[PDB]
Amino acid sequence: SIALPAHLRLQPIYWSRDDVAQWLKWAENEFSLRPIDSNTFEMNGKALLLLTKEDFRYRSPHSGDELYELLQHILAQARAVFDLYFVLDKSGSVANNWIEIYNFVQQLAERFVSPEMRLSFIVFSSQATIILPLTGDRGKISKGLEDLKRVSPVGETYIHEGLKLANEQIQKAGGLKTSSIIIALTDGKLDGLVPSYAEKEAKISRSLGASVYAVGVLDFEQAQLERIADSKEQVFPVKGGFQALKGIINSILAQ
């Protein structure tokens, strides 16, 4: 699950011949492929995009099709370098404080909407729902915010179901050149065996290379959020949470 090198976080069209060779090495290790010569693709990225899938299969009978499809997924992420997932609590306990949550997500979304950022809105209570599938399209983001404002909080606090939806997206569309951060807004008041499920799911987030941040609403349980987020420093209240994250994002945006 090693991330793509920084040189290779750029669009393939800007890749150098050295980059293409480095890309082939990374894949060999990432996908346990039959090793190939560094001179299998003796060209730059622009040239690589002109090859057909047949050309990939001819140059690498054992890995060509897989390499071609790996490249298609990279091209699909386009300029995305940072995937941001909002896991929002919509349990009964926040029915009278949802606008605060919405405003928080709204401010961050309007702040960093750009070609390099893709957004996903997830809400959770007794069930979890994807309000906005991961997208950097500003129109879809604007519609997703409208849907988010219309949410009526009801139900229990099953945050592990919310974290899963993000993990799922990260597994399918969220690797390669994109860094994934998950922002979970909740009071962290869990019942029964939910605390274990939530920490287990959060560990799967970190195993996918995702950094988990916990923004606490209401009288939030500090201890619980510290076990969900990566660290105590990644757990901060809503007040001043906009300023905090703005920086974390801006720093990651530096690539």
Residue 16 is assigned to a ligand binding site: no
Residue 93 or 205 having the CB closest to Mg ion: 93
Q: How far apart are the first and last CA of the chain?
A: 20
Task: Please list every residue from 127 through 146 that binds Mg ion, using CB under 5 A.
Answer: none
Minimum separation from the CB atom of position 169 to Mg ion (A): 23
Torsion of CA 222, 223, 224, 226, to 10 degrees: 80
**Cβ atoms 65, 57 nearer than 8 A:** yes
Residue 139 or 192 having the CB closest to Mg ion: 192
Residue 238 or 244 having the CB closest to Mg ion: 238
Is residue 249 a contact residue for Mg ion (CB under 5 A)? no
Residue with tokens 């945006």: 253
In the structure encoding, which two tokens stand for residue 143, read together? 């519609």
Q: Which residues pair with 45 in a beta bridge?
A: none
Residue 38 is assigned to a ligand binding site: no
Choosing from 157, 167, 179, 234, the residue that interacts with Mg ion (CB under 5 A) is 157
Minimum separation from the CB atom of position 228 to Mg ion (A): 13
Pick the stretch among 42-50, 92-100, 112-120, 142-150 that binds Mg ion (CB under 5 A).
Answer: 92-100
Alpha helices in the chain (DSSP H): 17-30, 45-48, 53-59, 64-77, 98-112, 138-149, 159-173, 194-207, 222-228, 241-253
Is residue 91 a contact residue for Mg ion (CB under 5 A)? yes
Task: Give contact residues for Mg ion (rule: CB under 5 A).
Answer: 89, 91, 93, 157, 187, 217-218, 238
Binding site, residues?
91, 93, 157
